[PDB]
Design a protein around this ligand. Structure first.
Ligand SMILES: Nc1nc(O)c2ncn([C@H]3O[C@H](COP(=O)(O)OP(O)(O)=S)[C@H](O)[C@@H]3O)c2n1
Ligand SMILES: [Mg+2]
Ligand SMILES: [Mg+2]
Length: 174
């Protein structure tokens, strides 16, 4: 269930009600442990909940954690490194895909480290629509605060040395 270095896997995002939200066709595994999966993608197919397919335009490093209720996409844009952070269940892997539940809230980090909390309105609506339990609401709000603290500390995927190491590892294996 821990994916192997050099494996190309699919990543599947679901909503709390079990419906698929988003699917990424191809991510090359750079690190796979008990607690952490790191991957790279570039010009992967992406499929939406209506079946429509689009293609990513720039390389990204993805970071998944088995304990924390978030995952992080590090995007290498012409105007600098952006992060897109999903509040989520932790991941599970199997032969089909790395899988997680998307919980609406996300954080955008700009190249200079400034962050914006996104989709608070969508989270409130979906939490009422899909009846998220109170404990999930407590966990997600706590993990918003943890993610902000990691961004401010440049911890984990937000470390400049993380980006230097994994950007170069992905550039070589691709
Ligand atoms: N070209 C294109 N076409 C689509 O249909 C797209 N759908 C999503 N992207 C985006 O995928 C990422 C996330 O989309 P989002 O922030 O709107 O996600 P949710 O989960 O809040 S709906 C990219 O930032 C990026 O904006 C799409 N990009
Ligand atoms: Mg999200
Ligand atoms: Mg969202």
């Amino acid at each position: 269930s821990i994916p192997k270095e050099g494996e190309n896997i699919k990543i599947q995002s679901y909503k709390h009600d079990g419906k698929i939200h988003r699917v990424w066709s191809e991510t090359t595994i750079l690190k796979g442990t008990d607690h952490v999966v790191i991957g790279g993608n570039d010009h992967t197919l992406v499929t939406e909940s209506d079946g429509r397919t689009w293609i990513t335009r720039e390389p990204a490093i993805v970071y998944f954690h088995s304990e924390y209720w978030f995952n992080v996409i590090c995007m290498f844009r012409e105007d600098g490194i952006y992060y897109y952070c999903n509040l989520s269940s932790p991941f599970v892997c199997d032969e089909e895909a790395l899988k997680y539940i998307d919980y609406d809230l996300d954080i955008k980090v700009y190249p200079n480290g400034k962050y914006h909390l996104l989709d608070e309105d969508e989270y409130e609506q979906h939490m009422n629509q899909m009846n998220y339990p109170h404990d999930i609401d407590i966990i997600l709000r706590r993990n918003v605060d943890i993610l902000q603290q990691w961004i401010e500390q440049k911890k984990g995927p937000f470390a400049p040395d993380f980006i230097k190491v994994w950007k170069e590892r992905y550039k070589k294996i691709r």
